[PDB]
Design a protein around this ligand. Structure first.
Ligand code: THP
Ligand code: CA
Length: 132
């Protein structure tokens, strides 16, 4: 895997972000995590998860996306990646706060699965947010 640059256009919620990627606007969806729902007919921690992601990505000097080894888009045309804000993975950062659960683990796009699971287990042990 490798990291590629991208530019924030707009944070939609905890796990979905509009980025300019190779000079094209695209919606990206965070691999291997689910933040609580706030759009579809809002769940506990959804607003919190959304605020966390917005803050973390708006404050970055540099945003990067890292696709995994399989599909690079989902059925909705959203890019599927690990997103990094100044070298810090947003997917991990949410899970580590108990603001997302490890989810949608679809092979072969599971390269950081164990890494994320370890962060979720610490968020659980610490009773944070979703685990409170
Ligand atoms: C994260 C992820 C989501 N999705 C799809 C699965 C879910 O489809 P369905 O809506 O048909 O269940 C939806 C979950 O995304 P959200 O959590 O944004 O709703 O997006 C993928 O297909 N692959 C992925 O890697
Ligand atoms: Ca979600």
């Amino acid at each position: 895997l490798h990291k590629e640059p991208a530019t924030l256009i707009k944070a939609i919620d905890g796990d979905t972000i509009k980025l300019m990627y190779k000079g094209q606007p695209m919606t990206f969806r965070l691999l291997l995590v689910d933040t609580p729902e706030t759009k579809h007919p809002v769940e506990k921690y959804g607003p919190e998860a959304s605020a966390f992601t917005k803050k973390m990505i708006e404050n970055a000097k540099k945003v990067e996306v890292e696709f995994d080894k399989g599909q690079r888009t989902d059925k909705y045309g959203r890019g599927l990646a690990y997103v990094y804000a100044d070298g810090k993975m947003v997917n991990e950062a949410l899970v580590r706060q108990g603001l997302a659960k490890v989810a949608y683990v679809y092979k072969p796009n599971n390269t950081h699965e164990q890494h994320l699971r370890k962060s979720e287990a610490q968020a659980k042990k610490e009773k944070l947010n979703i685990w409170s």
